[PDB]
Amino acid sequence: GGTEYKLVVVGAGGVGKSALTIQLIQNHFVDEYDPTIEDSYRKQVVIDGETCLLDILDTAGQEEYSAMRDQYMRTGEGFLCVFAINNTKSFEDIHHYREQIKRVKDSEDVPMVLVGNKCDLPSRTVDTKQAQDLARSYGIPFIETSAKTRQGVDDAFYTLVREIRKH
Numbered sequence: 224g225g226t227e228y229k230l231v232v233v234g235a236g237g238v239g240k241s242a243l244t245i246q247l248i249q250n251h252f253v254d255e256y257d258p259t260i261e262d263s264y265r266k267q268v269v270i271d272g273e274t275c276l277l278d279i280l281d282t283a284g285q286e287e288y289s290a291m292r293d294q295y296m297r298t299g300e301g302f303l304c305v306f307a308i309n310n311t312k313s314f315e316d317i318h319h320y321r322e323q324i325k326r327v328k329d330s331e332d333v334p335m336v337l338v339g340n341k342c343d344l345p346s347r348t349v350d351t352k353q354a355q356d357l358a359r360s361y362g363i364p365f366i367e368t369s370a371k372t373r374q375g376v377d378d379a380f381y382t383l384v385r386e387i388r389k390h
């Protein structure tokens with residue numbers, strides 16, 4: 224079959240995991256999203272001239288520690304770790320998501336991208352420099368996004384695929 228990349232989107236409640244997923248897949252911004260038991264979506268894209276299938280797995284609605292969250296992390300080949308640039312707590316939580324991924328994968332070297340979403344909103348509390356320093360510590364890219372204005376959305380997911388392809 225065509226090459227498929229299972230990309231898992233993680234982050235604190237309300238950061239925009241689902242809006243990012245739906246913007247990528249459907250090309251629409253949602254004002255609200257109700258997670259279900261399984262929220263995954265597939266779409267063909269071309270990245271660096273190579274066609275592939277993205278299967279996006281959204282962890283929205285999963286509890287912080289649960290069998291289904293672990294199953295999603297076991298299945299994922301790459302991870303978007305999302306915070307919101309107007310919510311400091313969601314940025315402080317990033318280390319937690321990275322630790323959970325490293326635990327489930329039993330590895331320090333897992334394809335990941337740090338995503339700072341909601342860059343369109345006025346009340347920024349996290350600087351790009353802060354996010355870049357965290358990303359540098361983890362050895363991963365940082366991408367700023369807005370699911371609303373569409374800034375950076377493709378870049379975040381496509382960068383994650385590039386990270387998977389480098390391993």
Ligand SMILES: Nc1nc2c(ncn2[C@@H]2O[C@H](COP(=O)(O)OP(=O)(O)NP(=O)(O)O)[C@@H](O)[C@H]2O)c(=O)[nH]1
Pocket residue numbers: 234235236237238239240241242243253254255256258282283284340341342343344368369370371372
């Ligand atoms: N202005 C703005 N609002 C956004 C952005 N991304 C998401 N939102 C809004 O933020 C709220 C939460 O988004 P949602 O995608 O449900 O976040 P989530 O991380 O999946 N939440 P949960 O894990 O609680 O289900 C929604 O009202 C959505 O419209 C963005 O980039 N900009």
Ligand code: NA
Pocket residue numbers: 246247248249250251
């Ligand atoms: Na899109």
